[PDB]
Design a protein around this ligand. Structure first.
Ligand SMILES: NS(=O)(=O)c1c(F)c(F)c(NS(=O)(=O)c2c(F)c(F)c(F)c(F)c2F)c(F)c1F
Ligand SMILES: NS(=O)(=O)c1c(F)c(F)c(F)c(F)c1F
Ligand SMILES: OC[C@H]1O[C@@H](O)[C@H](O)[C@@H](O)[C@@H]1O
Ligand SMILES: [Zn+2]
Length: 257
């Protein structure tokens, strides 16, 4: 029953998810000058060559592209991570206008949207067990700015008309998530949480410094989705982002000097 509106949005979540006021909540503002280079970080490895996308779903909060995670087909390793993390899904957060939409901010700057590639630590066997662990998940976050079109996003944009309302799903096989990455893998990293209820504090965040460019037309199609189900009052799926939360006793590390 949580959402993003005035009556059930981020400022209400703590009533049912008290960890919302916890010590390692996400997202955060990334102060680029306070972030510190860490020469200890190992090289980051995004290995998506054998990814198997399955389907796309409007879950009433965002849309998720789900992957076969029954083997080590698309994995994230290295950087701050110990061991292997397997891609399970990606989704976005976006705004009603280009000046807002991201969850993380960079020196308080908000981007038009933010892509999250969600991975779970294979040492825990399944996603559900992983979210009982302080190092259960790794989320690769990528900012979107509006400018030139992103060709590798277009297949996503074009299927959205078929999942307009909550509960609708569609086939989404043979999608390559490598087409959503920027050129550089420079990143910031810190320990945090899911940014949606249940807000569990299980995530190693890896936020890429380089945004991807998408066209206005691409993001406008995100904004034609509905939060509601078919046959219910229409409410546009926009502003599905949680604002920055207190950093508390954390440090953000940079992969780049
Ligand atoms: N803590 S929370 O965000 O998860 C949450 C919440 F903050 C709530 F307020 C409810 N209350 S509600 O009854 O569902 C309800 C709404 F959520 C509405 F948005 C609304 F417009 C209503 F009229 C309404 F009745 C709720 F259940 C819930 F879990
Ligand atoms: N925003 S997020 O990347 O923190 C995130 C998750 F990591 C997750 F596993 C989910 F199930 C979500 F719904 C979600 F929004
Ligand atoms: O005590 C010194 C140490 O302080 C820590 O907070 C920093 O993360 C380290 O990089 C530093 O070496
Ligand atoms: Zn997310």
């Amino acid at each position: 029953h949580w959402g993003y509106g005035k009556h059930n949005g981020p400022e209400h979540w703590h009533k049912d998810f008290p960890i919302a006021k916890g010590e390692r909540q996400s997202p955060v503002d990334i102060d680029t000058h306070t972030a510190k280079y860490d020469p200890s970080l190992k090289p980051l490895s995004v290995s998506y060559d054998q990814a198997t996308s399955l389907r796309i779903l409007n879950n009433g909060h965002a849309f998720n592209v789900e992957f076969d995670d029954s083997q080590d087909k698309a994995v994230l390793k290295g950087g701050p991570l110990d061991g292997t993390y397997r891609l399970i899904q990606f989704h976005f957060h976006w705004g009603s206008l280009d000046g807002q939409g991201s969850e993380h901010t960079v020196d308080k700057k908000k981007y038009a949207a933010e892509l999250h590639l969600v991975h779970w630590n294979t040492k825990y066997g399944d996603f559900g067990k992983a979210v009982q662990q302080p190092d259960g998940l790794a989320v690769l976050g990528i900012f979107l700015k509006v400018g030139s079109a992103k060709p590798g996003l277009q297949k996503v944009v074009d299927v959205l008309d078929s999942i307009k309302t909550k509960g609708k799903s569609a086939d989404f096989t043979n999608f390559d998530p490598r087409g959503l990455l920027p050129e550089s893998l420079d990143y910031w990293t810190y320990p945090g949480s899911l940014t949606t209820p249940p807000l569990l504090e299980c995530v190693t965040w890896i936020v890429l410094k380089e945004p991807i460019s998408v066209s206005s037309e691409q993001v406008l199609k995100f904004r034609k989705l509905n939060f509601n189900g078919e046959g219910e009052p229409e409410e546009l799926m926009v502003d599905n982002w949680r604002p920055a939360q207190p950093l508390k006793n954390r440090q953000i590390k940079a992969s780049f000097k």
